[PDB]
Predict the structure of Dynamin-1.
Amino acid sequence: MDPQLERQVETIRNLVDSYMAIVNKTVRDLMPKTIMHLMINNTKEFIFSE
């Protein structure tokens, strides 16, 4: 299967790397936004109002 698996393995690996690059961009973006929405702003609301 070496004539096939060699190419199939390389094909899959390149696809995985590209897709994971996209996922890393998305998570880097979401995390600061998620933290601000749920943690910092609620703290400001509590300190002023509660």
